[PDB]
């Protein structure tokens, strides 16, 4: 299924939505993982919070000023940490004449304005704030407690399993990358202006890596997995010029985005908004975690796979420890939990 590897959108009912892990296995049975990114529109009746009029006192402890350098669709992003500020102070700056969104009719027009102006007037991103906007009683798709097998690290083995908040403004960006340990991720857009994404199918990920290595040879010699530094920006026109397959999608308030193992993604914010995210796992991820290429030059996020191999692959434990496990990943295959569909 999904032989084109295009980004799929799902509209689950209230009954289908209630079981997170089962619904993840369902979208994989439909071939959603092949694109490396999927959209899930929850039922209109479901709300994770009754109101967003009570979060002005929330503190953003480490805001980052995003400085961009480059030309011809090739850029490097540098971070400057600024002093702590509240959501109220952040919203005032985000909506001010200096940083607000420019006037536009079509999305294509805004996308052109982004790629033409990303090196001028550096914006401020209220990124990686530890916290949640979900109310305590919410049991459906609660980012703060998904309860997947990723919790086996947490049970006696900065958290990858904990929630993060992202306060955006016009022209704030996220560079090309896969998740830490090639895990899955979940992103919910709570309120505000849209967030646009770019994605490369996992079956074509090595092609993006080869292109990036050719463009930045100095970075590659210093670190094998330099894309994990999250500093590299490559425009969709540069990917098209070199025949790299990719897709695009715009996420609106009240919508979920799912990233899959070894799915490269990048993107930008249209204006003032707030997103919540975390990492999660399925049984299909274990092989991805065992084979993930890690950052060498840095301190970096490293999860021991030992606990997963004992529990889910006891027959291969001895062969794995000796380094003789030569399993080849087929990126098209769905998770074993999708067997019932
Ligand atoms: C400690 N942190 C762990 C998660 C790390 C991480 C991994 N992925 N990732 C992102 N992916 C998708 C969208 C966004 C986005 O809208 N803003 C910012 N970061 C994003 C951020 C950052 C560092
Ligand atoms: Cl608000
Ligand atoms: Zn990500
Ligand atoms: Zn490195």
User: Domains in the chain, start-ordered, CATH in brackets?
Assistant: 7-341 (2.60.120.650)
d(CA 109, CA 6) in angstroms, rounded, equals 23
List Cβ neighbours of 227 (8 Å cut-off, separation of 6 or more). 175, 176, 177, 178, 209, 212, 264
Determine if residue 47 is left, alpha or beta; phi over 0 gives left, psi from -120 to 50 gives alpha, anything else beta: beta
- Using only C-alpha atoms, the chain has a radius of gyration, in whole angstroms, of 20
d(CA 32, CA 93) in angstroms, rounded, equals 38
Sign of the alpha-carbon dihedral angle for 236, 239, 241, 246? negative
**Ligand nearest to the backbone CA of 178:** 3
Residue with CA nearest ligand 1 atom 2: 128
Q: Please give the order of strands across the beta sheet that includes 64-71.
A: 9-10, 37-40, 256-259, 184-192, 273-280, 164-168, 124-130, 64-71, 74-81, 232-234
Question: Cα separations (Å) of 13 from 20, 40, 331?
Answer: 12, 11, 28
On whether the CB atoms of residues 262 and 182 are closer than 8 A, the answer is yes
d(CA 219, CA 57) in angstroms, rounded, equals 41
d(CA 137, CA 129) in angstroms, rounded, equals 22
Task: Please give the distance, rounded to the nearest whole angstrom, from the Cα atom of residue 98 to the centre of ligand 3.
Answer: 28
Residue 195 CA from chain centroid, whole number: 12
**Ligand nearest to the backbone CA of 49:** 2
- Residue 166 burial by Cβ neighbours in a 10 Å radius (0-12, 13-18, 19+): buried
d(CA 334, CA 26) in angstroms, rounded, equals 9
On whether the CB atoms of residues 98 and 121 are closer than 8 A, the answer is yes
d(CA 7, CA 177) in angstroms, rounded, equals 17
d(CA 305, CA 181) in angstroms, rounded, equals 10
List Cβ neighbours of 323 (8 Å cut-off, separation of 6 or more). none
Ligand 1 contact, 198 CB (< 6 A):
no
Provide the 3-class DSSP secondary structure of residue 117. Answer: helix
Max alpha carbon distance in the chain (Å)? 63
Sign of the alpha-carbon dihedral angle for 314, 300, 179, 243? negative
331 counts as catalytic: no
Provide the 3-class DSSP secondary structure of residue 106. Answer: coil
Nearest ligand 1 atom, CA 160: 3
Determine if residue 72 is left, alpha or beta; phi over 0 gives left, psi from -120 to 50 gives alpha, anything else beta: left
- Residue 124 host element (H or E): strand 124-130
Q: Of the listed 21, 29, 219, 277, which one is catalytic?
A: 277
For residue 71, report the phi and psi dihedrals to the nearest 5 degrees.
-165, 170
d(CA 223, CA 326) in angstroms, rounded, equals 24
- Residue 46 burial by Cβ neighbours in a 10 Å radius (0-12, 13-18, 19+): middle
List Cβ neighbours of 182 (8 Å cut-off, separation of 6 or more). 261, 262, 285, 288, 289, 291, 292
**Entry resolution (Å):** 2.2
For residue 178, report the phi and psi dihedrals to the nearest 5 degrees.
-105, 170
Ligand 1 contact, 166 CB (< 6 A):
yes
Ligand 1 contact, 275 CB (< 6 A):
yes
d(CA 81, CA 57) in angstroms, rounded, equals 20
Closest among 273, 252, 258, 275 to 107, alpha carbons compared: 252
- Residue 176 host element (H or E): strand 173-177
On whether the CB atoms of residues 296 and 222 are closer than 8 A, the answer is no
Q: Where are the alpha helices (DSSP H) in 54-133?
A: 87-94, 107-117
Task: Please give the distance, rounded to the nearest whole angstrom, from the Cα atom of residue 320 to the centre of ligand 1.
Answer: 31
270 counts as catalytic: no
List Cβ neighbours of 197 (8 Å cut-off, separation of 6 or more). 37, 248, 249, 250, 251, 257, 265, 266, 267
In the PDB record, what is the listed experimental method?
X-ray
């Amino acid at each position: 299924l999904n032989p084109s590897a295009r980004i799929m959108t799902f509209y689950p009912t209230m009954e289908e939505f209630r079981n997170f892990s089962r619904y993840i296995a369902y979208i994989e049975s439909q071939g959603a993982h092949r694109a490396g990114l999927a959209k899930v529109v929850p039922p209109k009746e479901w709300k994770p919070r009754a109101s967003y009029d009570d979060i002005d006192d929330l503190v953003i402890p480490a805001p980052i000023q995003q400085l961009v350098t480059g030309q011809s669709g090739l850029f490097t992003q540098y971070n400057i940490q600024k002093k702590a500020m509240t959501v109220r102070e952040f919203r005032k700056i985000a909506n001010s004449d200096k940083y607000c969104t420019p006037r536009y009719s079509e999305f294509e027009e805004l996308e052109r304005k982004y790629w033409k102006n990303l090196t001028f007037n550096p914006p401020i991103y209220g990124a990686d704030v530890n916290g949640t906007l979900y109310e305590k009683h919410v049991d459906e798709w609660n980012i703060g407690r998904l309860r997947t097998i990723l919790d086996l690290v947490e049970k006696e083995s900065e958290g990858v399993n904990t929630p993060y908040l992202y306060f955006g403004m016009w022209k704030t960006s996220f560079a090309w990358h896969t998740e830490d340990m090639d895990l899955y991720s979940i992103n919910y857009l709570h309120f505000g202006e849209p967030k646009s994404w770019y994605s490369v199918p996992p079956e074509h990920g090595k092609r993006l890596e080869r292109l990036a290595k050719g463009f930045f040879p100095g970075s590659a010699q210093s670190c094998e997995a330099f894309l994990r530094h999250k500093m590299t920006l490559i425009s969709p026109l540069m990917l098209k010029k070199y025949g790299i397959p990719f897709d695009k999608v715009t996420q609106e308030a009240g919508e979920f985005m799912i990233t899959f193992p070894y799915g490269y993604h990048a993107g930008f914010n249209h204006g003032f908004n707030c997103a919540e995210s975390t990492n999660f796992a399925t049984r299909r991820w274990i092989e991805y975690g065992k084979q993930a290429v890690l950052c060498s030059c840095r301190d970096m996020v490293k999860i021991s796979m030992d606990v997963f191999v004992r529990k889910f692959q006891p027959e291969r434990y001895k062969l794995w420890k000796a380094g003789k496990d030569n399993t080849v990943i087929d990126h098209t295959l769905p998770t074993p939990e999708a067997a019932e569909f």
